[PDB]
Chains A and B, each alone.
Chain A
Amino acid sequence: AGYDLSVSTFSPDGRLYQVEYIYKSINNNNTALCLECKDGIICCCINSNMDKNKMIKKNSYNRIYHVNNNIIITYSGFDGDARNIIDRARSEANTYYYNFHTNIPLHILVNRISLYIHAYTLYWHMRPFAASIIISSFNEKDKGDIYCIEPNGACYKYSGIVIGKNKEMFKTEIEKKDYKDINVRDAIEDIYKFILTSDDHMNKNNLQNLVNFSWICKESSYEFQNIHEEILTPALNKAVEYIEK
C-alpha cells in the first residue's frame, strides 16, 4: 500500500513492512540450531531445500564459519549477505588486534555487527541485509554465550536459539530437558533426533550429507573444530535405531 515499497518509509501504524518481509524470507530459508552444553557449545546447520538437488559434493557446502579460531558464526538467510557480514566480522577482529593487540571481546563484535546490520535499515537505496546471524563462543571460566542479531538489528543473549523453517518445533524440542548439564558429546544424538523428527524432508539417508557441525569445548582446548565423521556416524546409527523402534 505504498508505505511497504521502501524500508525508509514508515507505515501509518508504526511497523516497517519491509522488515517483516525480511523475517518471512529468512523463516522460509534454511534452518540453523545452536545451543550450549556443559563441555561446550554446539551449532548445527541443516540444508533441507538441497534434497531435490542430488548433485552436491559430500559435505562441501558449509554454513558455519569461524573468527580467530575462537568464535563460531552461522546464519540462516541468503548466502551473500551472510558472507559480507562474516567478512565484516573478520575485518573488525583484524582492526581490533591491529590497533589494540588483544582478541576482540564477543560483546564488542556482536554489538558492532548489530549496528552494522541496522546501519542499512535507515536509508533508501541500499538493499537491506537479509540474514539472521548467530555468534557463539565458550570459555572455561565464563561457561558459554550465544548471541543472535535479527535483521532489524536486535541483539539478545540466548542460552539456545533456533531460526528458520520449523523453528517453533525445534525450540519446543530443545526445551524438553535442560541442556546445560548434557555434555556436547551426547547432545549430537538428540540433535539428530530433532532434525530427523521435526523436519519432514530429512530422511535417514540425508542426515550425513546435508548437515554441518562444530563445537568449542575442552576437548579441542576451547577452539574451533568440526566434528569428525567417526563421531557423527555412531550418533546417526543410534538415532536411526531409536526412531525406527
Chain B
Amino acid sequence: SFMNEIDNLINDVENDELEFCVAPVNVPRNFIKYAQTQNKKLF
C-alpha cells in the first residue's frame, strides 16, 4: 500500500524467477570479472 511505501521512505527501511539480479558494484558488467580476481573455485 501507499502508506507502507511512504513509511519505508521516511524510516529508510526498504522477485520473479525470470528477472535477473545484478550487483550494486560501480560497474556490474565487469563484476564477475572482479570476482574472478578473488577466486576461481566458484567460477
Contact = CB atoms under 8 A, between A and B. Distances in A.
B13 to A, nearest CB: 8
A95 B3 contact: no
A99 B10 contact: yes
A88 B3 contact: yes
Contacts of A94: 7, 11
A99 B3 contact: no
Given A87-B3, A98-B13, A99-B10, 4 more contacts: A91-B3, A91-B7, A94-B11, A99-B11
Nearest to B4: A91
- Majority secondary structure of chain B interface residues (helix, strand, loop or mixed): helix
Sorting the interface of chain B by its residue count into under 10, 10 to 19, 20 to 34 or 35 or more gives under 10
- Majority secondary structure of chain A interface residues (helix, strand, loop or mixed): helix
Contacts of B7: 91, 94-95
B3 A98 contact: no
13 contacts: A87-B3, A88-B3, A91-B3, A91-B7, A94-B7, A94-B11, A95-B7, A95-B10, A95-B11, A98-B11, A98-B13, A99-B10, A99-B11
Contacts of B10: 95, 99
Contacts of A87: 3
Interface string A92-111: 00110011000000000000
Nearest to B6: A91
Interface string B1-35: 00100010011010000000000000000000000
A7 to B, nearest CB: 19
Nearest to A87: B3
A88 B7 CA distance: 10
Contacts of B3: 87-88, 91
A95 B13 CA distance: 10
A98 B13 CA distance: 10
What 9 A-B pairs are tightest by C-beta distance, nearest first? A91-B7, A98-B11, A95-B10, A95-B11, A95-B7, A88-B3, A94-B11, A91-B3, A99-B11
Interface in A69-101: 87-88, 91, 94-95, 98-99
Nearest to A88: B3
Contacts of A88: 3
Nearest to A84: B3
A137 B7 CA distance: 25
A98 B8 CA distance: 11
B7 to A, nearest CB: 5
